[PDB]
Each structure stands twice: as C-alpha cells, then as structure tokens.
Amino acid sequence: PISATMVGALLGLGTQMYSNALRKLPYMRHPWEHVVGMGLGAVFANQLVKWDVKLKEDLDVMLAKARAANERRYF
Amino acid sequence: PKSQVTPSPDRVKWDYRGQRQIIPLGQWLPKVAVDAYVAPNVVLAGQVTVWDGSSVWNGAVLRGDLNKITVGFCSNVQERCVVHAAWS
Ligand SMILES: CCCCCCCCCCC(CCCCCCCCCC)(CO[C@H]1O[C@@H](CO)[C@H](O[C@@H]2O[C@@H](CO)[C@H](O)[C@@H](O)[C@@H]2O)[C@@H](O)[C@@H]1O)CO[C@H]1O[C@@H](CO)[C@H](O[C@@H]2O[C@@H](CO)[C@H](O)[C@@H](O)[C@@H]2O)[C@@H](O)[C@H]1O
Numbered sequence: 001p002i003s004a005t006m007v008g009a010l011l012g013l014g015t016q017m018y019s020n021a022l023r024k025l026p027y028m029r030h031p032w033e034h035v036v037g038m039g040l041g042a043v044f045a046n047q048l049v050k051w052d053v054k055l056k057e058d059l060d061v062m063l064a065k066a067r068a069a070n071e072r073r074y075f
Numbered sequence: 076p077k078s079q080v081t082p083s084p085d086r087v088k089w090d091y092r093g094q095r096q097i098i099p100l101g102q103w104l105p106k107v108a109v110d111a112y113v114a115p116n117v118v119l120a121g122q123v124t125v126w127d128g129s130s131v132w133n134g135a136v137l138r139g140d141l142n143k144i145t146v147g148f149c150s151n152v153q154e155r156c157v158v159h160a161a162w163s
C-alpha cells in the first residue's frame with residue numbers, strides 16, 4: 001500500500017527539486033541533497049503519523065474527562 | 076620613423092589557463108544569469124549583463140568597456156558576433 005515512508009520520500013524529493021526549480025537551477029543540481037531530502041521527508045512523515053496516533057489518544061482522554069464532568073450536572 | 080621594437084623576455088607565449096571568459100574591468104563585473112548559456116569560447120569584458128533564457132554562442136565577444144551591454148530575456152547572440160558599445 002501507500003506507506004508513510006514512500007510518501008515522505010516522494011515529498012522530500014519533490015520539495016528539493018521544487019527548491020531547485022524556484023532558483024532557476026537544474027532540477028538535479030546537487031544529487032546528494034536530494035537523497036538528504038528523501039530521508040528527511042520519510043522521517044517527518046513517520047513522525048507525523050506517530051504523533052497523530054498519540055494526539056488522537058490524548059484527545060479521546062480529554063473528551064472522556066469533559067463528558068464525565070458534564071454528566072455530573074444531573075446529580 | 077623608428078622601425079625598432081623591444082621584445083619582452085617575460086612575455087607569455089602559452090597561457091596554460093587559456094583565455095578567461097569573464098574579464099572584470101575594475102569594479103565592472105559581467106553578470107550572467109544562472110539560466111543563461113554562455114559558450115566557453117565567449118569573452119565577456121566590462122559591464123555586460125546577460126539575462127535569463129539568453130544565450131551567447133561560440134566566438135562571440137561582448138566588450139562593455141566603454142558603455143553598458145545588455146542581452147534581454149530569451150534573446151540570443153549567435154556564433155562569432157562582436158557586440159561593442161561606444162561613449163556616445
Ligand atoms: C500530504 C500527503 C497526503 C498523503 C495521505 C494520503 C495517502 C494515504 C497514506 C496516509 C498514511 C501516511 C500519512 C502521510 C503523511 C503526509 C506526509 C507529511 C509530510 C512528510 C514530508 C496514514 O494514513 C493512515 O494513518 C492512520 C493513523 O495510524 C489513520 O487511521 C486511523 O488511525 C486512528 C487514530 O488513532 C483512527 O482512530 C482510526 O479511525 C483510523 O484507523 C489514517 O490517517 C490512515 O488510515 C499511510 O499510513 C502509514 O501510517 C501507519 C498506518 O497507521 C503505518 O505504520 C503504522 O505505525 C504504527 C502507528 O503509529 C502502527 O502501530 C503500525 O501498526 C502501523 O504499521 C504506516 O506503515 C503507513 O501505512
């Protein structure tokens with residue numbers, strides 16, 4: 001399927017070549033920073049997914065606390 | 076009438092560096108855009124500006140020593156073209 005690693009690598013390569021294009025340079029000007037960008041994009045995508053899971057868990061906990069606080073109004 | 080010349084013993088008969096393509100004249104440095112193609116045989120002297128998409132081809136000399144020389148967007152100066160500027 002579409003994993004976070006591959007979408008991150010594609011986004012990193014795309015942003016590196018987009019930066020190269022924006023400066024009127026050839027797309028593959030410096031090949032090493034393309035690899036660096038692919039690695040950074042993969043890392044960022046994986047960290048984003050890992051953070052999203054924890055963020056949803058914390059939101060669920062906070063909403064459970066809020067619902068429990070509201071429910072006590074009926075006593 | 077003289078008919079007399081004095082050869083210099085320090086004159087160089089072969090420059091291993093070849094001819095330098097960009098020749099700055101004092102504070103005038105030729106400006107070449109990163110998107111512009113300038114052939115390795117080209118000589119740019121003085122204040123010469125080459126813009127985006129422009130191209131200068133083999134054997135061309137662009138001496139902007141006297142006045143300014145400007146090559147526009149996507150405009151090309153082809154092979155062995157001498158572009159020079161006068162005071163007035
Ligand atoms: C802008 C580009 C648009 C691309 C998106 C469309 C393409 C679809 C792929 C989107 C994609 C990557 C996100 C890309 C980030 C963008 C890059 C950011 C900039 C980078 C430069 C996330 O997509 C999935 O992520 C899930 C979150 O886990 C979510 O499911 C919801 O979760 C619940 C919440 O708790 C909800 O309650 C519930 O309703 C849903 O179940 C959904 O978002 C979705 O199913 C692909 O999934 C990737 O993440 C996980 C799978 O999870 C995989 O690894 C996981 O790791 C552990 C979990 O940490 C797990 O332990 C492990 O078992 C698992 O293997 C990866 O291998 C890969 O598959």
Ligand SMILES: CCCCCCCCCCCCCCCCCCCC(=O)O[C@H](COC(=O)CCCCCCCCCCCCCC)COP(=O)(O)OCCN
Nearest residue numbers: 008011012013015016019033034036037038040041042044
């Ligand atoms: C988010 C949607 C997904 C987007 C895709 C994300 C993908 C992950 C990121 C991929 C990045 C790929 C980049 C390839 C690596 C190239 C880095 C080389 C930079 C470098 O060598 O350092 C000097 C400049 O520093 C720099 O260029 C550093 C620039 C950093 C700018 C931002 C700094 C962090 C700010 C915080 C984030 C931005 C705000 C967010 C709210 C270069 O020097 P030189 O040779 O070019 O010449 C002098 C120019 N100065």
